[PDB]
Each structure stands twice: as structure tokens, then as C-alpha cells.
């Protein structure tokens, strides 16, 4: 079918987007060194789609 | 006292409302205190003393940054307390800006 | 006794120095609310809990009353 095609495409899309945001998170904690993060999003797309959440204990 | 009813005493001091008028505020107090019921946080009161002194220099009143140092010594000098860190963390967290403190009585 | 009134003194002094600390850090807590919070932290409790509660309860009488 092409429906199972679409299903696997959406699985891959969700997983790749999630891992893209996780990798940018793990690179953002660091510290002419910021040229990696500035170059990878030169116009933005999936830059920060979820704000950093916080609550107190 | 048991801590659970102590929360409801606190709610009637802060708000003028009685403890039978509302139960939602007390329910929020039970919501946060419960499943945090035991102390699990760590204290480092040395760093927080050093952070109050930087704040009192930031007011540009420098005589009062060292008066607090001698008043901060007295809490250890008596030493009848549980943690010196806890009430000071509470009182630092609720801070508003006095902009530079246009007075202080200094006892 | 003497050491039993000196124990009653040693809280009354600390509650008086903490009252100076309360106004120089500019909280909205007065002495009456302070006495409850000092009993709670005498037993030991998360101040991170207490801070979020009082930031809401103070916000529960300036927009809900």
C-alpha cells in the first residue's frame, strides 16, 4: 500500500524531529565556537519548538 | 502540631478567608506539600550567604553589607535551629526590588 | 529555671534578627506569617515548596479577592 508508506514516514519524521531537538539541547549547554549552532539554523527550522519547562520542588 | 492542619492555619493568616469558607487553597497546599512530604533538598548555606553579600553591595550601601554579616553570624552563634538555610532560602526567593532601599533602621 | 528561660530567649532573639532579614530582602511576609514559616522549617521542609505556595497564595488575594 501507500498508507503503510505514510505510516513509516510519519514514524521517521517524529523520531528525527525529536532527536534534532534533543541534540540541539545537548549542544546548547556548552560554554569562535558558537558558529556550529548558528550555521546549522541559518534561517531557523526546528530551532526551539518547545520552551524549557521548569517548576520548583 | 501535624503539618497538614498547619497548612490551613497558614492559609488563614495569609488570606483573610476562613478555613471552612474555602477548601481549594488548602487543597493546593496539600497538592504541593504532599509527595514532597519528607525533606529531600540539600543545603549549601555558605554560597547563599555569599550571594546575600553581593546583593547588599549591589544596593551601593556597603556598611549594611557587613552589618548583615555580623547578624548572619548570630544565627550560628545561638544554634538552636534546625537548618539556617531553609528560612533564608524562603526569604530570598520571595524578594521584590526596594530599588536601592531608601531606608533601614538597623535595629 | 535559668536554662529554660534562656532557651525561651534563644528563639526570641533569632525571631528578632530574622525580622530584620525579612525587611531588608523585601518580602511581603510579616512577623505573624514568619512565625508559622519558622515553625515549619524548624521541623524541616522544602523551602522550594513553601516559596511556590506563597507565590500562589499571595496571588490568591490580589486578583481573586
DSSP chain C: --HHHHHHHHHHHHHHHHHHHHHHTT-S--HHHHHHHHHHHHH---HHHHHHHHHHHGGGSSS--
Alpha-carbon distance C31 to nearest alpha carbon in chain B (angstroms) = 11
- CA of A56: which chain C residue's CA is closest? C48
Is A57 touching C (CB cutoff 8 A)? Answer: yes
The answer to whether B50 touches B41, Cβ cutoff 8 Å, is no
C45 touches chain A (CB under 8 A): no
Q: A55, C46: Cβ pair inside 8 Å?
A: no
Of A14, C36, C46, the C-alpha closest to B32 is C46
C18: nearest CB among B32, B87, B93: B87
Q: How far apart are CA C51 and CA A42, in angstroms?
A: 41
Residues 26-45 of chain B whose Cβ lies under 8 A from any Cβ of chain A: 36, 40-41
Distance from CA of B76 to the nearest CA of A (A): 26
* Surface-to-core class of residue A40, CB atoms within 10 Å of its CB (0-12 exposed, 13-18 middle, 19+ buried): middle
Angle at C61 between CA C59 and CA C62, to 5 degrees: 70
Chain breaks in chain A (C to N over 2.5 A) after: 31
Cell numbers describing residue C31? 512577623
H helix intervals, B34-105: 45-58, 63-78, 84-93
Q: Which residues, including other chains, have CB under 8 Å from residue B25's CB and lie 6 or more apart?
A: B11, B15, B17, C57, C60
Q: Which chain A residue's Cα is nearest to B35?
A: A57
For residue A45, what is its C-alpha cell?
527550522
- Are the C-beta atoms of B5 and B48 separated by less than 8 Å? no
> In units of Å, what resolution does this entry have?
8.1
Give the chain B residue whose CA is nearest to the CA of C63. B15
Give B32's contacts (C-beta < 8 A, 6+ positions apart): C49, C52, C53
Contact C27/B95 with Cβ under 8 angstroms? yes
Structure-determination technique? cryo-EM
CA gap B80, C11 in Å, rounded: 7
Contact criterion met (CB below 8 Å) for B28 and C56:
yes
> Which of C49, C9, C61, A1 has its CA nearest to residue B31?
C49
**Rounded distance, CA B2 to CA C45, Å?**
13
Amino acid at each position: 500500500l501507500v498508507s503503510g508508506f505514510e505510516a513509516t514516514i510519519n514514524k521517521f519524521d517524529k523520531n528525527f524531529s525529536a532527536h534534532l531537538l534533543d541534540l540541539l539541547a545537548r549542544l546548547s549547554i556548552y560554554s569562535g565556537m558558537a558558529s556550529v549552532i548558528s550555521r546549522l539554523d541559518f534561517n531557523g527550522f526546528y530551532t526551539e519548538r518547545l520552551e524549557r519547562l521548569s517548576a520548583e520542588r | 502540631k501535624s503539618p497538614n492542619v498547619l497548612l490551613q492555619n497558614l492559609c488563614c493568616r495569609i488570606l483573610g478567608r476562613s478555613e471552612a469558607d474555602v477548601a481549594q487553597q488548602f487543597q493546593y497546599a496539600v497538592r504541593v506539600i504532599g509527595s514532597n512530604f519528607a525533606p529531600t533538598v540539600e543545603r549549601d548555606e555558605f554560597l547563599v550567604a555569599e550571594k546575600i553579600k553581593k546583593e547588599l553591595i549591589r544596593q551601593r550601601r556597603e556598611a549594611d553589607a557587613a552589618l548583615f554579616s555580623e547578624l548572619h553570624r548570630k544565627l550560628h552563634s545561638q544554634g538552636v535551629l534546625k537548618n539556617k538555610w531553609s528560612i533564608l532560602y524562603l526569604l530570598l526567593s520571595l524578594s521584590e526590588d526596594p530599588r536601592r532601599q531608601p531606608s533601614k533602621v538597623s535595629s | 529555671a535559668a536554662a529554660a528561660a534562656a532557651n525561651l530567649n534563644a528563639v526570641r532573639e533569632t525571631m528578632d534578627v530574622l525580622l530584620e532579614i525579612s525587611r531588608i530582602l523585601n518580602t511581603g511576609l510579616d512577623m505573624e506569617t514568619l512565625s508559622i514559616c519558622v515553625r515549619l522549617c524548624e521541623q524541616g521542609i522544602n523551602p522550594e515548596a513553601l516559596s511556590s505556595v506563597i507565590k500562589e497564595l499571595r496571588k490568591a488575594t490580589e486578583a481573586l479577592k
